[PDB]
């Protein structure tokens, strides 16, 4: 039922905090997360700093689900990589751009895949 | 304080239902709304049906703010048009694509501007 | 998988009682949140004697959008007034539980899409 | 408008007590929700005697994101342990109201951005 609770929190939240590392510096940013099961996906650009951070250090921490001080939320430590499956990239692209998507594609578009290694439900 | 309540609901919600008209048919769709004061903006593509609907009939109805059966929400009847100010279009583009934006632009991108004529707070 | 589809639609309907009912009056759209009961794919929803509006039965109903991570239904159909007293009573017994004691719009679907 | 900027930052801090504190241990990021007090732009947050971690004072703090329609702060600074007992007590009197009775991390900012 633990997965079930994890999934419930993921189903109800698409914004989270990604913390990546640049040498000795943490970088925290708010962004949109899609998920497929316990796998997370977040959009990026080929030239964006968060993309280069991930290429050089795959260790990321995601916080997601904190609505108010009483919200149970997730702390996810995982390994991030750039999604190479073109069908997954196109699908995510179409989901992200659905309000305006009319078949264009974006060459600089990339997807950060996050494979969780540890998931803690906090404030449960 | 009525505006203040309207704004509070707009500040806390970016997804709403747009209802447009195609001849004698209503079309309802969920989508993302940005606002500037009581003016609403929603992204679209030049060739999308909702864009053509608006070109031919500017009368739209937006429902926004319904979280649960007890939520106070808004019913907005307004006049929709395609935003022609390039700086407003680019700004909205940058806000929408911020997670992946790296300077590209999208020729098919358009912005639907909605000027409210009537706003009712329901379930207050 | 016409049967898995039917099954997914009924499931969404069985698990949701509130939807969005949209219509058109003249060249003007209208939208409101409504409480919906269903019999199969047919929907029922409860709602001046000195005024009349030109009837347009074309409606669009959105049901099931609970979270951004929700599959929901877009239903295009024809709305009419339900006159059967037994049906209206069955609706009252379901929508008015503590009350002891009224129009019902019937929506027959022509097209149903599961959107995500 | 260095002064309107300072003013907007203080306002965000004055109106928010919860933020996100991020750090790095080795080559691994850490993130947690924390309760923050502030003195001007300086932040204070309360938090095994058989273990020690290699100290990295580089932290990133996000404060003020309340709704998607929120301007918030990204603060990059240096974290340290606050040793002043008077300060620690002032923090306790603000964070522990019903209690009658403890480390405090001090964050000095090096860069602050208002993001939207």
Which residues on D lie below 8 Å from B10 (Cβ)? 69
Q: Which H or E run contains B102?
A: none
**Angle at the Cα of B86 from the Cα atoms of A93 and B28, rounded to 5 degrees:** 50
Which residues on A lie below 8 Å from D68 (Cβ)? 15
Chains B and D: 3 or more CB pairs within 8 Å of each other:
yes
From CA B68, how far away is CA B49, in angstroms rounded? 30
Which residues on A lie below 8 Å from B106 (Cβ)? 100, 104, 106
Q: Which of B42, B47, B100 sits opposite A44 (nearest CB)?
A: B100
From CA C91, how far away is CA C85, in angstroms rounded? 10
In our burial notation (b when 16+ CB lie closer than 10 A, e otherwise), range C65-101 reads beeeeeebbbbbbebeebeeeeebeebeeebeeeeee
From CA B28, how far away is CA D56, in angstroms rounded? 52
**Angle at the Cα of C59 from the Cα atoms of C53 and C61, rounded to 5 degrees:** 135
- Joined tokens for residue B83: 């935003």
- Contacts of residue A70, Cβ cutoff 8 Å, sequence gap at least 6: A123
Contact across the interface for C68 and B28, Cβ inside 8 Å? no
From CA B43, how far away is CA B121, in angstroms rounded? 24
From CA C30, how far away is CA A61, in angstroms rounded? 45
| Block residue for tokens 């439900």 | A121
- Contacts of residue C11, Cβ cutoff 8 Å, sequence gap at least 6: none
From CA A117, how far away is CA D28, in angstroms rounded? 13
Domains in chain A, ordered, with CATH?
A: 1-124 (2.30.110.10)
Q: How many CA atoms lie within 13 A of D66 on its CB side?
A: 13
Contact across the interface for A100 and B48, Cβ inside 8 Å? yes
Q: Which H or E run contains B95?
A: helix B86-96
Dihedral Cα D5, D10, D15, D20, nearest 10 deg: 90
Q: How far is CA A39 from CA A118, B99, C47, in A?
A: 12, 18, 44
| Block residue for tokens 């499931």 | C11
| Block residue for tokens 């940058």 | B94
Which residues on B lie below 8 Å from A102 (Cβ)? 45-48, 108
- What technique determined this structure? X-ray
Chains A and B: 3 or more CB pairs within 8 Å of each other:
yes
Which chain D residue has the Cα nearest residue A68? D66
Q: How far is CA B24 from CA A82, C23, C41, C43, D110, in A?
A: 47, 9, 23, 21, 60
From CA B71, how far away is CA D23, in angstroms rounded? 38
| Block residue for tokens 């606002």 | B35
Q: Is residue B75 within 8 Å of residue B19, measured between CB atoms?
A: no
């Amino acid at each position: 039922e633990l997965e079930d609770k994890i999934l419930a929190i993921l189903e109800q939240h698409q914004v989270g905090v990604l913390t990546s590392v640049q040498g000795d510096f943490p970088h925290a940013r708010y962004m949109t997360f899609l998920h497929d099961g316990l796998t997370l996906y977040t959009p990026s650009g080929k030239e964006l700093p968060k993309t280069e951070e991930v290429r050089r250090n795959p260790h990321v921490c995601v916080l997601i689900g904190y609505d108010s001080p009483g919200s149970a939320f997730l702390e996810i430590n995982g390994l991030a990589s750039l999604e190479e499956d073109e069908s997954i990239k196109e699908r995510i692209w179409e989901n992200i751009s659905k309000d305006w998507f009319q078949g264009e594609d974006s060459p600089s578009f990339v997807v950060i895949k996050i494979v969780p290694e540890q998931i803690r439900i906090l404030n449960s």
